[PDB]
Structures are given as C-alpha cells and as structure tokens.
C-alpha cells in the first residue's frame, strides 16, 4: 500500500470493465499513455490515488512549480537540477507539500486522454474520441461522481490554532490549502487594514453629524485618493507575495489546457504537446454575439424587475394611506424582490456556468475570468441599482441610509449564518452519523476519514467570497459621504470574516484542489471599475446637496457643468496617480528583468 | 585601408596628444578598453601636401568585427527555419542571406549604427581630464564622445550618405505603395516607421474625407446628420489607432526590431552616474539611483512644465482682450490683423525657448536610455505645443461660441499655414542646399589636384550639410492634424479632406528632405512609435468631450430644451460618459498584436524557458 493523496468516487453500480479501464489508464507509464500513478480501492466504489516519490518530483517539473535554489534565485524545477534547491534531500520526502503533491495528480488525471476508444468501455452511451479527457466524460456522464483531494488532520489542526490580535498567517494557509485561497486570506487581511483610515475618518461625521460642503469634500477627496492608493499598494504587495511563493515567476500560458476543453487532437504550434486544437475565431463568435447580448438582456431584465417593486413600493405606501394588516403589507414588496433576486442569481449563475463551458476556453484562468465577469456585472447591478434609484431617482437620502444599513448590518449577521456558522453545526451532527456508518462496519480510521470527506460540502470557489469585499468597497467608496459608518461596519464584519471563513475552509468542506495563482486575476480591473464609478457617485451627491444648491438657485445649468468639470479633473487626476505608481515595486523588477536576461543568454547558448 | 561609414569632425585647432589619444581608444583592442575599430585621416600624409585635413577623421571596421559588434547590439536577424533570432558570429552560418564569400549580410545603416554605439560605449580609465585640455576633466566611467562633444574638441559625427544607393531609393520613393522596406534599409527602422505611419494615416483618413465631403457641399445641418458622423468619427479614432499597433506589430516583426530586448541595451552617452556592476547585464557601466531622477522629474520638472501651460493660457487670454480693443477701434482694416500677427509671433518665441529648457531639464533628470529620454522630452514639449495651438481653438469653440470664426480659424491652419509649412520644411532648405551643393562641386573643379578628391568633396559636402533634428516635428504635423478631424469635424467637414490633400505632397516633401536636404542620420531600431500612441489615443478621448459638446450646443438640440438646461447638459454628459466606456471596452477587445505575431512571440518565449531549464 501507499500514502492515498487524492479519492475517486464512482457512481453505485459501475461496471468491473470500466473500473479496471479506469484502473489501466491511472497505473500504465506514461510512455503507452496515461499517468505513472497508483490506483487502489477504499478497502461504496471509493479509490485512493498516490504516487512514487520520484514520480511526484517528476510530475512536479510537468506543472513547473517554482522553487528557491541555493544562490536565493527562484527557478521551475527540473529532477536532474534536482540537488540545486534549497531544502532539498534524496533522504527527504518533505520537499513537496502534500498540496502540491494533490494538485500534481489532479493535473496527470486531468490530462488523461482516451487513444482508441470509441466510448467509455461498458458503457456505450458516453462516447469518446481521440484526444477527449476521460475524467471530463467520466464527469459529464455520471460515472465518475467526484475527484477530491484528502485532508491531513494533524497538520490541519496545527493550523487552525495559528489561524483562530495578530498578523494571519498567509504562508501556512498557502502551504496546506494552495495559492488561491492564501491569496484571498492575504486580500481580505489587506483590505481590512486599508477600510481602517476610512472608518477612523468617518466616526467623526457621523457622532457629531458633520453636514457641511468643505467637510464633506475633504472625506470625498480622501476617500478618491485611497481607493486609487489601496488598489495600487495591493499589486505591489502581491507582487512581492507571490515572487516569495515562485508563483509570479510561473508562465500559466504555456500550461496544458482544462478538461473541459475540447478539439481535433494535434500538435500545439508553442508547446509543441499533442493536445486538442479549437480556432479562437470559434470562441470569439460565440462570446460577441450568444453569451455577451445574454449577458445585456439579463442586465435589462434586471432593471425591469427592479421597477416592478419601486412600483410596488407605490402600491403599497397607498392602501396604507386607505392600521394592523397594512403594517404588514409594507413589508410585503421588500420580501418578494429579494426572493425574486435569489431566484434571478440562483437562475443566472446555471446560464453563466453552461455558456462559459460552451465558450470553450483553453486555460482553467480564462474559464475563471470569463464566468466571474459575467455573474459580477449581474450581482453588481442587482444589489446597487435599487441603490442608485433611491440615492439619483426619488433622491431619498433618509432610505439609502436605512438600505445601507440593512446590507451592512442584519444582512451581514445573517449572511455569516448561511455562510459558516449553520453549515458548521450541521456538519458537526454529520460527524456522528459518518462515526455510526463506520461502527457497523467493525483499521477503519482510514474508511471513516474517506466516508466523512467524501459526503462533506465542496468549496464551489472564491467568487462568494471576494463578492462580499467587492459589495463592501461599493458601499464605501460610493456613499461614504450619505452612510460615514460604512466603513467601520466594513472592518467590524471582517474581523469576524476571517475566523468563520477559516472555520468554513478547515471544519464545513472538503479540502479544496489547490490552484497556482500569481494574482487576484480579473477582480482588479472589477475594483478598479468600482473606484472609477465613485468619482461620478461622490460629485453627483455633493452637487445634490441643498448646501451647494444654495449657492446655485436659478443657475443649475452652471452649477452641473462645474460638478462635470471637477469629476473630469478627478477622473484625469486619479489615472495619472495609477500610473505613476509602480505595479510591482523595485526589487521584484529588478530580479525579474536578470531573470529575464539569463533565459536569453541562455537561447543564444543552446542555439 | 578600409571603406569609410562614419565620419568625425575635430575644432580647428586640436592638439596631437589629444588627437593620438582619441585614435589610440577607436584603434585598441576591447580587451584592452576601446572599440576595436578602425582610424584614419580624410587625406593621407601624401593627399595632405594637395589639400588640407580640416581635422576630418574616417571611421570604419573589420567584416569579422562588424560581425561581433552586430551580436554586442543584439540584432534580429531571419534564419533559415524562418525564425527571428538575435544574431551571434558562433551561429552566423544559421542565417538567412549570409556568406563568408559576401560582405552584404549587414547594411551601410546597421553598420554606421554599430560604429555609433561603441564610439557612445567608450568610457574614461584612468584619464582624470581629456589629455591636452585639462578644462575638460574625466572620472572612471565618464563617456568619451560625451565630454568631446559638451567641451567642444569634437564639432560632430555623423554616418556617410551612400550615393548611388540613396539614388536607387529616390527614384522608387519619388499612385503607389511607400517602399516602406527599402527607407528602412537605408535611414533606419526610426525614419521608416515615420514614413510607415504617414502613409497609414493617410489612407486612415480618407473615409474621414469622404463621409464628410457631402456635410459641407449639401450642408447637411441636421440633429441626426451630425450625430451619425460624429458616432463615426468616435468608432474611427479608436479603431485607426488599434488596427496601427496590429499593422506596425506585422511589420517589426518583420523587420526584427519587435524581437528586440531594449531595455539590456547599454546606456546613452549623455547618461552619468559612479562606475559599478550593473545587477541586470553584468556590465562596468555608470550607475545612477533611480530615486534623484524621480525627484527631479515629479519636483522640479513637472510643476516647471504646469508653469509654462498656465503662463499659454495666460498669454492667450491677452490676445483674446486684445481682439476686443482692436474689434472697438475699427488705417483701422490693417490695425485689426495687428493682434493676430503679435500672439502668432509670441507664440514662436515661446515654442523656441521652451524646447531649450525642455531638452534641458530631459537631459538633467539624467534618463539611462535613449528611448526613455526621446519619450519625456516628446511629452513635454507636445503638452506646450498642444495647448498653444488648441487652447484658443477650444475659446473660440465653447467660450465665444463662434462656429463663423472657428471654420475661418480652422481653414488657415488647414489650408495657408500647411502650404507655408511645406516651403519651410523642405522647398526652401532643398533650394538653398542646391545652391550651395553647385557652388561646392565648382570650387573643387577649380582646383584641379594631383589627387582623386572624390571622398573628400562628398565628406565636405555631407559635413556642413542641415543635420536632421529627429522625427518630433514630422510626427507632431499628423498630431496636430488628427487634433482638427477628430476633434472639430461636425463645424469643419472639409478637415480630413485637406488633411489627406497635404499629406499626398508631405510623403515627396519629406522624402526629398530627408535624400537632399539633411545629411544621413544615424539609425534608431524603434519597434513601435513610442509615447506617440498616447499622445494620439488621448486626442480621441478629448474628441468625445468635444463632439459631445459641440451637439449639445447646437440651435437644434436646445430647441428641445428650452428653459431645461441643466436637464439638456445631463443628458449629454451621461451620452459621453457611455461613449467613453464603450471606447474603452472597443480598444481592449480588439488586440494590440495580430494571432499569427502572437504565437510566433509565444513560441520563442517558450523556446527561451526550455534553454534556460538545459542551461542550469
Ligand atoms: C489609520 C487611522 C487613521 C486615523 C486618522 C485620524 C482621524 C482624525 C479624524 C479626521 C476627520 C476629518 C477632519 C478634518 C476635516 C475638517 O473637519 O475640515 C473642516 C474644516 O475645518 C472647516 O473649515
Ligand atoms: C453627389 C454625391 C457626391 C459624393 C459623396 C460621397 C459621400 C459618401 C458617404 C456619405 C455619408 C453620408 C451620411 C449621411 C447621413 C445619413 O444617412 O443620415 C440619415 C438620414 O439622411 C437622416 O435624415
Ligand atoms: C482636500 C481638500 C479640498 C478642499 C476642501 C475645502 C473646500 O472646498 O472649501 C471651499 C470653501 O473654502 C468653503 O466652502
Ligand atoms: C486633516 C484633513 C484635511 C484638512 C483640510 C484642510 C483644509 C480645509 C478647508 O479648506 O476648509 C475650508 C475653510
Ligand atoms: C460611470 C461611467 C464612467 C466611465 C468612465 C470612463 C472610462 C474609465 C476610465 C476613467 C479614468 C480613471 C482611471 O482610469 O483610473 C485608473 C484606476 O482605476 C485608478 O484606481
Ligand atoms: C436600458 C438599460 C439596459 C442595459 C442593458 C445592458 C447594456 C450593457 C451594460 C453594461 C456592460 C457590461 C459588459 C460586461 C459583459 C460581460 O460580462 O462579458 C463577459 C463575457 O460575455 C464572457 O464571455
Ligand atoms: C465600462 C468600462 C470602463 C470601466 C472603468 C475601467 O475600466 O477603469 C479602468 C480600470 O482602472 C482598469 O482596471
Ligand atoms: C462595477 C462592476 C465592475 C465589473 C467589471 C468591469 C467590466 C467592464 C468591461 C471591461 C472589458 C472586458
Ligand atoms: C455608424 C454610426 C451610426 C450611428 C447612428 C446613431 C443614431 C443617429 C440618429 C439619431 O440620433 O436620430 C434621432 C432621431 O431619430 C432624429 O432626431
Ligand atoms: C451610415 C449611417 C446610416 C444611419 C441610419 C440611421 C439614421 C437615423 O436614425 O435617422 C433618424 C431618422
Ligand atoms: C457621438 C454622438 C454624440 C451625440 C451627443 C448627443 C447629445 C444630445 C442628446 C440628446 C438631446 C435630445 C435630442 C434633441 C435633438 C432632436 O431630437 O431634435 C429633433
Ligand atoms: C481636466 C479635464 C480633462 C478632460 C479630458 C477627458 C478626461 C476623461 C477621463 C479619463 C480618461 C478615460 C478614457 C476612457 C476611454 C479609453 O480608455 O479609451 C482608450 C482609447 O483611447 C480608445 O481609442
Ligand atoms: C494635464 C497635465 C499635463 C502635465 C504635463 C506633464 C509632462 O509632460 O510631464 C513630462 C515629465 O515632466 C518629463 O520629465
Ligand atoms: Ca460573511
Ligand atoms: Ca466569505
Ligand atoms: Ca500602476
Ligand atoms: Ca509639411
Ligand atoms: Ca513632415
Ligand atoms: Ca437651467
Ligand atoms: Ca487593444
């Protein structure tokens, strides 16, 4: 037996000849086609996957992981170079982390590709075709339920007591759980830091109710200046992060394409690897004239509905006019939309998820971007245009406060409910009933570690996650100046955040497949959009104060073409400050422009 | 000895010891420190009792070493695989075209280009001041061809015109394509991507020109009409520039030039800083801290450049008080042209001594590269010359409101100040070298030596020859160009049409500029045109605020909003505010680089990871 990394789950009754197909496929040496794993039953069609310690450092130089060598330099690793980085050992086995080591045999299955087969061996149904991804089909077809990796339990542990005032431990998060999510642990404990000069700013306005104009434009000024600043200081934060973890010197383009893509099978132009080819030109069509006009009706839609109960609203505030049943029924058009909007995003994100598949993209990144793009501008929409209709179109100030704080208060409470703390507890209650599964059964520590993990929840991604902070950052950086505590409540739930989304990653799901991220990917530019769009929300409100309208009585024409004028500075003003600040800071460039130089040095060596 | 390339012209009195000095590091071996070139006088011992050297001194090189300095420079060359690949003597059997039989491998231009830079690379030892001249003192590190050229020991070096070639050329450049490959061969890939996009943005314009030919023969003043043009005029601005990077990425590549890693180059002589390793190249060249040329730019550079902008406001707004006296007044049909004819001159007064203390302050912030110089020195003084000539555009367009004065304002730029500019660019300098050219090949003949004078009247000639200033002024004529097109099309239809009528005689007044005018300048491999494409991208950003503008102004528009006018102003404002966004969006959806450039570029990034995995 062998140290079991990763589990596959069939479905109840697969057939013998397909799970010694499949068995065939994950053992078979890489020269006849097909991963140099092991392949090993529980003992419920579970099967535990690992690999040789030489074939792991193998497969680890496929993927090209970047380690530190002896002379400090960061390089991707190669087994015959195998002895010129640091913390390296033959008498070791600790130089991979079991992560790593996860995410190497994902990648081998992943690029699993069927040679001759016609169809899935018993099951004729699932056809396949040259240079088709098995575990894709397996999937599709429902043969193959689930691919997981397995928790280590000690070193789980050892963590959770580092994780839950202190700085988070971002390098151990990396380490156990992958460059994804350490980088959404680094982004959230970031952020929090960045809204405290806001919070701080904002107590005053609101404790001694701080309503004049040089005031309010002082902490719009500020509150302009730092969302351009934090955004900035985050990519070059980042930029160091993952320089230190050799992820940024990683060339995620050159990697093998996801198992969802598919293609005529042939020779790739770059790499050179026979993988399936598909014209870009395809996907182009596809993605400007179904998925983007999809995406715009949506959009429309969104906007219709959201009419509906600001027309609902009306009704409403009128058969209360015309006094115990109509104190009910005011509460009644709130209820339906946010039901309604649950329906839309529960509905949306299955549209989102089948035309981002049915795009098909070449990397898991593209993939990634594309969906999360699409299902953001919705969200976005869903929750801040009812927000911008109060503030902009009935102009009541009073109720964009009391919306604000719903969304920042009880919603939040409950949010963090639904989140970790309610699936948690019925986890818990799990743990006894996989406990009770095991007993019948009569060494089962490995069989109840598998049966637990298998029917524990599976992290569906980030998105949900970095939505939270993005919808944070709207209300701040939009109306700080209608809601001054906006940013305090912000740094309130964050500190809470942190503890129950750690307590959601260790306790509630299953370990997640760790992903080599260099970045926060496209929710930069997602953030970057939201810090331009509150130049327009910052002038627009202080334009509509009756302080500045005073000023203005019968000229409003004048009055909106110094406010335009001013936002135009403010928007000029805002781009060069992004611009002269540096995306990645000195020392990080510099090592990356002599690394850059020796691979050239080194084409002219071998040419 | 050899074939003469580049030519150095010594002040009319120089001391031997710093004449011998200054041949001994051109002549030393690099090993020693010192291109290992080749020296020698315009006339030989023997040829100098018939006429005098006038301290002109011919440069040249070996086939081998011309050969080693072509690797030192890093130039792409095509193989026979057809990959672009940086050239190396160990690997010259690889490439395309070469022979050990031929010599015609490497251009006249690569070559003079070559000379150039190891003249630019040569750097004081031990010397602590130029031997003989103890004023002009050196430390380790320190230039050479820098402190010549700044003490004045040095008048000038410049490459020598290759005739019968530059003939060829001439006869081929001047309906027709521009020998865009053949101007590279001889001028540079600098001078060529000029001509490149001249001729781009010519045919660029030509739908500009037509579409808006009828809006002023039918004069077509509809609500409707002007917003289909302009919508045009918005989705042509971002496309034009777009599909300019995707047709110059074609073309560098091409040449090579896009394979090129620019920013390992070694510094420009203007460049000082303390003698040390660099950490990137390995290289003994001056290092300077990054941190003292930021605080010259953002502290004292940057408010100067304000300053000035304020103070071309400032003036503006006197002539446009002056034109109110001067419109009271009316001896008073002369007095009225009066103020024009001052502001016009203030103006060049100006624009003279601002380029001198805008090369100036470029040259003290102290920039390690020749590019990244050439791209601060380009925005500062296209910032000045934007604003002057835009400025009080923009007055008489949104503070007057006078669309009478405006087309009549417009019409001059476009028509009569464009014709005065082809006579001083090129007519009358062309004239006045002609003459002079006449007048040189006479004296000579006059002469009649015992020796063949034939190098000597063409080093003569070519030495006291215009020297090209660079490509600013050309590039800057298309600026200001598309400035009037993009901007003011819906009150002035005809500006592309004689924006394309000037730039069919720009092409030939250019071309006979650079081949009879200007003597040969040396050759910059440019990959791109640099600052240029935001300079030309913010001109249609400023073209939507405009456009946007100018409808919203319109009798047409405002007879729909009569007392509203706040109302009318919101609704143009969030019009311009969608079109920007969708301008962006169109710009990063459509690719700065072609698929095929793209994967040809991938392929050899990956080529260079799989060397550097052999290597270590
Ligand atoms: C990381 C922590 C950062 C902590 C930072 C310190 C917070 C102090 C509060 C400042 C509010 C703004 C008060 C200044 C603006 C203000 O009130 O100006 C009106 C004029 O005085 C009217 O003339
Ligand atoms: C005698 C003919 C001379 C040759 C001239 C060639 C011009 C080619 C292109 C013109 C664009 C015209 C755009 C017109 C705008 C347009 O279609 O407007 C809709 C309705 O006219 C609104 O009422
Ligand atoms: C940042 C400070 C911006 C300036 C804020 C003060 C400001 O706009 O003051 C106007 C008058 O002095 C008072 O109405
Ligand atoms: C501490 C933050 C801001 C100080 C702003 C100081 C300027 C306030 C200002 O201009 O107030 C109009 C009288
Ligand atoms: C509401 C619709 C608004 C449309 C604004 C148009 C274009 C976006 C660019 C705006 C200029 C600012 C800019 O590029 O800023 C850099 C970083 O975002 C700074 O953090
Ligand atoms: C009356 C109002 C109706 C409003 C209707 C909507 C108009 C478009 C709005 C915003 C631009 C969003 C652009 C984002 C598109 C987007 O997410 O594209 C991902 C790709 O589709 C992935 O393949
Ligand atoms: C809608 C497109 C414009 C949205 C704003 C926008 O893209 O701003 C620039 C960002 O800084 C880039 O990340
Ligand atoms: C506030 C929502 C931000 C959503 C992201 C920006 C999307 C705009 C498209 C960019 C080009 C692709
Ligand atoms: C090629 C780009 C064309 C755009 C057409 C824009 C729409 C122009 C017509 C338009 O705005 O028409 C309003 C009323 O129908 C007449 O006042
Ligand atoms: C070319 C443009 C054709 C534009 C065609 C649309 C013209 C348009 O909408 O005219 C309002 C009546
Ligand atoms: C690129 C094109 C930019 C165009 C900017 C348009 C700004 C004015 C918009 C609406 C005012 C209402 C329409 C009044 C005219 C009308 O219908 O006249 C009969
Ligand atoms: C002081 C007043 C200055 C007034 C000047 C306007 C400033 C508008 C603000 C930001 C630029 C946003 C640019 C968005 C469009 C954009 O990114 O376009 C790409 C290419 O330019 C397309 O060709
Ligand atoms: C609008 C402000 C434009 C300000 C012009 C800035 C400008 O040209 O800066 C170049 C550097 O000063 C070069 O060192
Ligand atoms: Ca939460
Ligand atoms: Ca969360
Ligand atoms: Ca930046
Ligand atoms: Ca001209
Ligand atoms: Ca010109
Ligand atoms: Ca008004
Ligand atoms: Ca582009």
Request: charged fraction near 20%.
């Amino acid at each position: 037996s062998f140290t079991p990394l990763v589990v596959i789950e069939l479905a109840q009754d697969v057939k013998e000849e397909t799970k010694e197909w499949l068995k065939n496929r994950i053992i078979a040496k890489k020269k006849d086609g097909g991963a140099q794993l092991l392949f090993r039953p529980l003992l419920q069609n579970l099967y535990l996957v690992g690999a040789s310690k030489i074939r792991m450092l193998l497969g680890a130089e496929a993927v090209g992981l970047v380690k530190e060598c002896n002379d400090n330099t960061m390089r991707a690793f190669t087994y015959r170079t195998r002895q010129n980085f640091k913390g390296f050992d033959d008498n070791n086995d600790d130089f991979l982390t079991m992560a790593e080591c996860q995410f190497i045999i994902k990648h081998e299955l992943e690029n699993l590709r069927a040679k001759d087969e016609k169809m899935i061996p018993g099951y004729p149904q699932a056809k396949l075709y040259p240079g088709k991804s098995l575990l894709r089909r397996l999937l599709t077809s429902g043969i193959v339920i689930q691919v997981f990796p397995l928790h280590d339990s000690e070193a789980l542990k050892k963590l959770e007591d580092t994780w839950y005032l202190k700085y988070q431990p971002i390098d151990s998060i990396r380490g156990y759980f992958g460059e994804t999510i350490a980088l959404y642990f680094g982004f959230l404990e970031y952020f929090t830091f960045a809204l405290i000069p806001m919070a701080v700013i904002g107590l005053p306005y609101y404790l001694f109710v701080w309503e004049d104009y040089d005031k309010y434009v002082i902490f719009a000024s500020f509150n302009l200046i730092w969302s351009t600043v934090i955004l900035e200081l985050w990519k070059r934060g980042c930029a160091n992060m993952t320089y230190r973890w050799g992820t940024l010197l990683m060339k995620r383009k050159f990697e093998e394409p996801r198992p969802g893509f598919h293609g005529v099978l042939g020779i790739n132009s770059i790499t050179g690897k026979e993988e399936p080819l598909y014209p870009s030109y395809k996907r182009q069509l596809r993605i400007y004239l179904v998925s983007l006009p999809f995406v715009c009706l949506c959009l429309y839609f969104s906007l219709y509905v959201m009419m509906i109960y600001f027309d609902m609203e009306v009704w409403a505030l009128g058969l209360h006019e015309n006094s115990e049943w109509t104190s009910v029924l005011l509460y009644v058009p709130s209820i339906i939309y946010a039901i309604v909007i649950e329906i839309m995003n529960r509905l949306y994100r299955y549209a989102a998820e089948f035309l981002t598949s049915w795009e098909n993209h070449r990397l898991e990144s593209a993939y990634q971007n594309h969906l999360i793009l699409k299902v953001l501008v919705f969200n976005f929409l869903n929750c801040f245009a009812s927000l911008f209709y109060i503030a902009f179109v009935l102009k009541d100030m009073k109720l964009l406060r009391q919306s604000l704080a719903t969304l920042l208060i009880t919603s939040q409470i409950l949010n963090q409910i639904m989140e970790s703390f309610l699936p948690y507890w019925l986890q818990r209650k799990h743990g006894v009933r996989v406990k009770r599964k095991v007993q019948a059964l009569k060494d089962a520590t490995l069989y109840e570690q598998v049966i637990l993990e298998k029917e524990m929840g599976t992290y569906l991604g980030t998105f949900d996650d970095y939505l939270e902070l993005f919808l944070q950052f709207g209300y701040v950086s939009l109306f700080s100046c209608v809601y001054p505590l906006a940013a305090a409540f912000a740094v309130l739930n964050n500190f809470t955040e942190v503890n129950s989304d750690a307590l959601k990653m260790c306790r509630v799901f299953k370990r997640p497949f760790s992903e080599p991220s260099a970045n926060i990917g496209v929710w930069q530019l997602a953030f970057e959009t939201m810090s331009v769009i509150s130049v327009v929300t910052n002038c627009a409100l202080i334009g509509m104060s009756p302080q500045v309208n005073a000023v203005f009585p019968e000229s409003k024409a004048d009055l909106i073409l110094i406010v335009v004028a001013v936002e135009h500075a403010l928007l000029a003003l805002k781009f060069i400050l992004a611009f002269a600040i540096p995306d990645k800071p000195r020392h990080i460039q510099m090592k990356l422009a002599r690394l850059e130089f020796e691979s050239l040095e080194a084409l002219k060596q071998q040419q």
